[PDB]
């Protein structure tokens, strides 16, 4: 996907301020709470019976850290997302069979987490740039379905 230099600037400046140890777990936890059918894929994570149990679950925080690292890798390779996410696409598509609509959902939850964390700093133009990114990541993760 193609961001303008101003879009790249907006995305890069905000991402350098993200707590990479926490935001991934926050987005994954909210995905499991808001879209409860995604809990089907995380049976081995233990207690997901309540929102507090989800957000306090150490396996959720740990796995969210890996998810955020993949988004960081996408941000560094904005015009080769397909090659970047190739092995991840085979995992999610060929072995896990996650419906790709859920890639869009997780991306939109990440956008909600960034808005929550950054407040008025997460301006409409900054959001518009992040929507391009999360859409490109979702599309690249789904290429093995395409």
């Amino acid at each position: 996907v193609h961001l303008t230099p101003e879009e790249k600037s907006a995305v890069t400046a905000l991402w350098g301020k993200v707590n990479v140890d926490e935001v991934g777990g926050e987005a994954l936890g909210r995905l499991l709470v808001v879209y409860p059918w995604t809990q089907r894929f995380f049976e081995s994570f233990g207690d997901l019976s309540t929102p507090d149990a989800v957000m306090g679950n150490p396996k959720v925080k740990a796995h969210g850290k890996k998810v955020l690292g993949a988004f960081s890798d996408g941000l560094a390779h904005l015009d080769n997302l397909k090659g970047t996410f190739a092995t991840l696409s085979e995992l999610h598509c060929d072995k896990l069979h996650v419906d790709p609509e859920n890639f869009r959902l997780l991306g939109n939850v990440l956008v909600c987490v960034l808005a929550h964390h950054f407040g008025k700093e997460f301006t409409p133009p900054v959001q518009a740039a992040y929507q391009k990114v999360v859409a490109g990541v979702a599309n690249a993760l789904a290429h093995k379905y395409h």
Partner: protein, 140 residues
């Protein structure tokens, strides 16, 4: 099905929105127009630039509709009946677009209410906006 806890959560979060409701509706619209440019074709007679008085005035109408839905959360099909007729019959709004505006409304709430936008309240607000969207698309 909005649970009792969902209705309590939605009442609380929207109650804290207060008299900013009009401004937040306008911001959600701007967020949608910039993030999802296909939605702009429904407003060719609007000036969609930042600070537009038409977007500000329309955002107040949107906020007032949601406030009506909150106040009549057990009877939303009836409360929003005229609005569902408008969107489906006259405007012929693509149902995909209600998901886009709902997402931008959540983003707007998240950006303005850091204390209220907990995971539980996030879940309740998403279900609420999905319920509003279902009513507004029920009449094709």
């Amino acid at each position: 099905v909005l649970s009792p806890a969902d209705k309590t959560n939605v009442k609380a979060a929207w109650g804290k929105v207060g008299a900013h409701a009009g401004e937040y509706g306008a911001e959600a619209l701007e967020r949608m127009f910039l993030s999802f440019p296909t939605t702009k074709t429904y407003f060719p007679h609007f000036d969609l630039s930042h600070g537009s008085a038409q977007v500000k005035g329309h955002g107040k109408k949107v906020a007032d509709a949601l406030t009506n839905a909150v106040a009549h959360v057990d009877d939303m099909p009836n409360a929003l009946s005229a609005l569902s007729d408008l969107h489906a019959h006259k405007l012929r709004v693509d149902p995909v677009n209600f998901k886009l505006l709902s997402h931008c409304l959540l983003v707007t709430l998240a950006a303005h209410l850091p204390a209220e936008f907990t995971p539980a309240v996030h879940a309740s607000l998403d279900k609420f906006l999905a319920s509003v969207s279902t009513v507004l698309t029920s009449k094709y």
